[PDB]
Amino acid sequence: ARYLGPKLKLSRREGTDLFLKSGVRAIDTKCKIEQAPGQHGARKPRLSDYGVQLREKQKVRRIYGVLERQFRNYYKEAARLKGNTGENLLALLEGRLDNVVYRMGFGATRAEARQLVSHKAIMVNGRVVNIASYQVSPNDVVSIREKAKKQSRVKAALELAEQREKPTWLEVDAGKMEGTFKRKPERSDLSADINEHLIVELYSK
Amino acid sequence: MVTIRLARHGAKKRPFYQVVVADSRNARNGRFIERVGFFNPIASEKEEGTRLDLDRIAHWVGQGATISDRVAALIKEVNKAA
Amino acid sequence: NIKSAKKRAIQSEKARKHNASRRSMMRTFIKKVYAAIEAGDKAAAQKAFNEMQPIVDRQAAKGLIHKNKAARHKANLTAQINKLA
Amino acid sequence: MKIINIGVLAHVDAGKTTLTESLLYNSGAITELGSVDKGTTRTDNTLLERQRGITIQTGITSFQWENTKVNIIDTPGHMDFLAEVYRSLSVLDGAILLISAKDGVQAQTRILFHALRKMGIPTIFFINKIDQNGIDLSTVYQDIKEKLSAEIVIKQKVELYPNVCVTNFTESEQWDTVIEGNDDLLEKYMSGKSLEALELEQEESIRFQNCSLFPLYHGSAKSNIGIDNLIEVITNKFYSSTHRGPSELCGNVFKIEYTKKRQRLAYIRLYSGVLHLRDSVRVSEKEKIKVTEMYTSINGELCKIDRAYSGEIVILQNEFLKLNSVLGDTKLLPQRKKIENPHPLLQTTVEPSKPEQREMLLDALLEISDSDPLLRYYVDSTTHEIILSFLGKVQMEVISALLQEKYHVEIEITEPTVIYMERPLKNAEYTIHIEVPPNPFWASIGLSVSPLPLGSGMQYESSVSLGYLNQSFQNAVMEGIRYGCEQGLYGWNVTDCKICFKYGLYYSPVSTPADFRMLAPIVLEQVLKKAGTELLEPYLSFKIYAPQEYLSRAYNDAPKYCANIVDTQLKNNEVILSGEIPARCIQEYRSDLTFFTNGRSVCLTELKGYHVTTGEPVCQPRRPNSRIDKVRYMFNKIT
RNA sequence: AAUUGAAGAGUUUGAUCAUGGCUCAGAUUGAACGCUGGCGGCAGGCCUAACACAUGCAAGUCGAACGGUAACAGGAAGAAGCUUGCUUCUUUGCUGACGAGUGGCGGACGGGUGAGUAAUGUCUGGGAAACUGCCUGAUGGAGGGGGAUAACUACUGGAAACGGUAGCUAAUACCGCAUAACGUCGCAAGACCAAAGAGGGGGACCUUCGGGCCUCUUGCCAUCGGAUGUGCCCAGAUGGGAUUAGCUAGUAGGUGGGGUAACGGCUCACCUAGGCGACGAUCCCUAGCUGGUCUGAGAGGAUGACCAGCCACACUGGAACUGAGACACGGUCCAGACUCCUACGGGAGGCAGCAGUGGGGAAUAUUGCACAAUGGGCGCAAGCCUGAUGCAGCCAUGCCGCGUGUAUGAAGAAGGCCUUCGGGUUGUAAAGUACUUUCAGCGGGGAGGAAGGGAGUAAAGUUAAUACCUUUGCUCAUUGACGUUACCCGCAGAAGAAGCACCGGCUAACUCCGUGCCAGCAGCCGCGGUAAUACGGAGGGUGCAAGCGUUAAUCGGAAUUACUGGG
Description:
Helix content of chain A is 40%, strand content 5%.
């Protein structure tokens, strides 16, 4: 399921930042960003009309790690939802349990937050959840179990969240590792950089 | 002979019985006159327990139908004074 | 095919002999009534109809008759014997 | 519990397998026909077996005596395809060869008797056909000592006459020399004095495990004297069955036959443990393979059984079963084996009859591979001529008889591919021309083949200087020259090639690397025409062993054989000599040692030395070649 | 709140514009093949041969219907050993119960198949000339007798299968009689028609001591009902072909008789000379129907495999009986084919029931466990039976979820590849370092599917009765195939777990070397006769992920069958 490959190399393929290596350190600039995605990344792409869509779809996937088949289920689930599809697709991907744990600063890179969920550390609403695809409910109170609490690695990872913008739609207790999701995020709050409209066009055909 | 009986459905290892009026010669999953309520033994204590429409059942008791012993226990579980 | 329930076959054989014997003796009493109509003897037709009335209704209780075919013998056949009368 | 399987080494058509059918009457009945003279049941099994006077392959039948199981099978000693009988030695460690009463044991049986020593399991001689005139009641039995080459002695002996004593013996005073070899028995001999013969039966029981000497036996089964009491010794003399049941079960396949009512049944003995019916088990394929059905092979009729005992052997159906496949895994046994020492015993064609019905006969050839494992075949020839690995004369009749019954096809072939390797007679100038005189392609080169010593093979060198030689296009010239070595003008394969290419003018705008490859083949068929043709045939050496007394009769075969004389050296009574004769006539050499040798003949050889050359006419095998590009243009070169 | 929905590109030509086919991007399947492959949950799994079938099993049950006892367990008269009441042990249907046998019910349901079927079928909405065991409402009856037969004995035919004759005996078996009505027939008068008793308990009374009698429960007989189920009638809708245009003689209608539970040429007798057909009759080819599934904006096109309804079929063909219901999967009788048995006189066999075997085919399963649960059959009930059902085992077949690690980590090394040999790329990748342990492995805890039912007790009903019984509270002992479960805790160790296609355009992603229109790729255009970005290999990258491609069927794109929507 997981790509488990060179995560930092994938950022240069998109030319921006997939945050697959947010790191305890801040900005990287050790991989030569943008100019060298690969051996023949010096070439200037023709950038086909089909390419901008596929370049946007793989970009949103790798930031979340969602597989292509599972990702298509989010698009069918978002078409039936009320309102514009453009917001509904990013909202359900924000509804994943591994992502909300990442918003709380629990773990550094997103790959760590997924495995943190996998080892029965997360316990939302007083019930442990292993699956990272879990659909978080409004007004949930996720919190790590006391046996997995403050296990060294978890403590230093929270320091990175202080430099993070920190979502307004959720808040962590910090003094006891107790997060609390509330309202579904607005499109203005999340992202405001990726072109979610491009993704729908790829599944429009 | 018409009779009220559970029809037994749901996912595997997830029983979900369907109380329904049907002649005995019919299959358990076969033809039935009409459904009336449902029984969820694995539901436990929550917002839902075991709905049971006694009003239509009170009509079939006079039609000669023979309630099964499983449905007969549901007539007691729904009680009258309780 | 070997079966523990083969007794239903031999008993149906044992039953059909006694059952047809009652159906055969009754119909011969019925064909006798038709001979009285062709003879033109309206008086003998009334007597033969009386001979069969107790036995033909009796079979209907036994299930040999669906107590509807026997009524037809008490219907159209009665319409013949009295028309000659 | 169980019992070891009895042998059946009826070598030289000893009919000792027909004596096994008498053993089924002794173990009978309580309900059986008792067998009959000729064929006759006796577990005949397949059709057209007893009608031939001998079975096509070794059989098996259920039996018991002395409150013990006594399986056995025979004979496999006919012919001719005796290697198949070598696969039955794995079926049981026992032996019971029937030496002939005429001049001792037959020499062909001595080859199967010497093969029993390699098995490492005990065996015993038996006086088959004792009730007959000319029998060696005191003279021919001594010939079994000279042929056994050991110190085996009979446990009893008599001469008749109507009498057939057996228990009255045996080996008084002098007998017991095998005990002298035992470390314990040799110490009792130092004490002296008379002792009970049962006391020496314990030391003989140790030597019996090493199979140091054949157990005694006498009396023809036809006379019905000693053919039953001697069978009691097989029960005690035979080694006890390795019963266990501790698991895990293990075994290996032994033999199988494609019965018409089968249609398949790969029987195999259980080396250890036991297999429950309708249960999966391990195999050599590395997958699950339950035995859906299995039954013991009773002599009177097949019989099902819910589970085989440990050490038992019984047929069982399966979807697949590779030969010698582990029932475990895995069996842990080791022994020597060979197909009578012959990689190919005179291959013979067998092209099926009919332009289409012959093709279905090819599939029956896969059915010959389901039968005896010592069998092989492949359509290496361009005509797809059959080339079966089976050998022997009478053994071929079973493969031909099988075609008249198991299938509906037949063929007659024997000469095989000629195997010619024609070479050019001398080197001569040649050239493909220049420009467009001319025909495609415009690219050309001047081939200049030259003579070479025999067996040197094909050769070529890039004489042209760069860049006209072409760093890449020049290689097609060699690959195209190889196309002309597939056949000469007479269709014989190219040999002694030496085409040193030289001149090669070519135009660049229209030249292609296939253009040079095409003109290159014409340089080899034109330069081969100046060769005038030179036919040659292989002449591999063929060493053979013959008895010295018959060795003088083998020199007469030399004048008829095309081979020339070669060095050889005697080896005691055995003799041998290093021959070297051509393969076209080498297949007939086997017939010569089967007659002049008197059955002692033996030989072996392998192909070697491409040089040969012989008359007459220089005939060649067509045709070469077709289904290739630009082939019709080579006909224009003839005129 | 409940369909908010319609995309296109390549390729005719030196170039273009239309017309016009092909082909690709989409979703999808009861798929196969090729390569790879750790686990879990939920489904599906013979679409080819309606081909033939070894073996097991798939429908039995009631002693509270009856004669009985063949076994087993108790009791009793009686017996033998001997620790004379400890043991041995013959009799005995006297009890608990139970083979065979009679009789009641089921076997027409459940389960499978799509051969047959273009309408005798089904769907949709109506219709009257019907039937309906079991279940149930209402009103009455339930009186009194006779004669046989299985089992069982004697004898006997036959190898078996399986009987024959002569005798004994019961019933809720059969059969006259008495008795009947709003029932049946008839305009009416009148005529005629049914049965069965058992089980539990008991005060007085009555006992030829078989029991009567009182009472409860259940069964039986008749009528009118109720529901359910089935048959029958019509209209409309429900495949292809006109290179099938005439078809029909019980054929159309009438009349009478017979026939069916019931209408009807449903069938005989006679009479009439009609009937159906271009809004497609007969014939020919094909097909189980439909709710639905897939695709599509919709209209529709394909299909209908699983799930569910009806129908057809049960080796082939045909026929009838038993019964409320069959003109009949695990019934009978017969012809025939195909197998097997024989003592060769004569019988046995029908897996399109679940497994399984051979054969066919590209291709699809275990001769599993349990009636714990539901349902059906029988029984008052307990229980028995159930290849239905509940599961388990097998296969990546499909969907879905998860893991195969995470963070740090530059000398930006070794190796590989590329080069203008300056270097770049592989590459935070690996090693190193710091942590974590899901799932597997291993060792302990452990839900839930279970309601009942049995015993016991109290009370309310019933009743002469504090007895029985019915019903409701209540106590004790309990009922799990799955199942070494779900799930949880604990243990060790980054430990056991990543492949496949593609990289000329369409279509996201490249160089180098080898082979020179050779070898080969290909869905369309088409490449290779040159350091081929289209071959082969390697480097790199992309796509996707326990799957990835290929092939096939179907739809959309295709407004190239346009009804919506073309000439």
